[PDB]
Structures are given as structure tokens and as C-alpha cells.
Amino acid sequence: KNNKSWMESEFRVYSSANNCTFEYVSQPFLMDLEGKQGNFKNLREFVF
Amino acid sequence: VFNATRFASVYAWNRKRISNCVADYSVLYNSASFSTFKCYGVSPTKLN
């Protein structure tokens, strides 16, 4: 709402990780975390 | 691993997991910087 800055606090993805076989990390970037309301403006389609 | 700072013990060896990469092994065979080079079951030129 206010004094926002769109900063990340919570990282509840997993508890632990062991016996890793693959690792990859992209280059540093800045994601647009600006939370807006209304209609949908972006469509990111994926297939796996 | 070959040029590591220090090696581990014979009973708690530092097992480095290697995955998703490439490496030249013929240069290691002809590096002239190793004392023992004994491959069992596969030649250094075949595994390339």
C-alpha cells in the first residue's frame, strides 16, 4: 500500500536441498514487482 | 580439483560432483604435470 518499494521478504519455496545433480543461475536482472490492478496486460505461455 | 588448495583424507575424500559440462582429457594425458596416469577399461583418447 504505502512506502512500498516492492521488496521481497518471504521465501517459502522449500526447507532443504541435498544431492543436487543440476544447477543453473541466470544473469542478474530487476523484475517488475509493481503490483497493479485491472485487466490482464501480459501473456506468458509455456510448455513443459 | 588437480590444482586445489588442499586435498582431503583417504577416508573422508572430497567427492566433487561434475555434471553438465565438457573438458579436454587428452591435454591432461599430455600435460606433463602428473606422476601417475593409469586409466582402466578405457583409453584417455577414447573417452574424449
Å resolution of this model?
4.3
* Dist CA B25 CA B23 (whole Å): 6
Chain B contact present for A22, CB below 8 A: yes
Q: Which is nearest to A20 in space by CA: B15, B12, B17? A: B17
Please calculate the CA angle B48-A25-A48 and round it to the nearest 5 degrees.
85
The experimental technique used to determine this model is: cryo-EM
Q: Pseudo-torsion of CA B38, B43, B45, B48, nearest 10°?
A: -100
**Distance in Å from the first CA to the final CA of chain B:** 19
User: From the CA atom positions of chain B, what is the Rg in Å?
Assistant: 13
Chain A contact present for B15, CB below 8 A: no
Spatial CB neighbours of B19, under 8 Å, sequence gap ≥ 6:
A21, A22
Q: Taking CB atoms and an 8 Å cut-off, how many pairs form between chains A and B?
A: 7
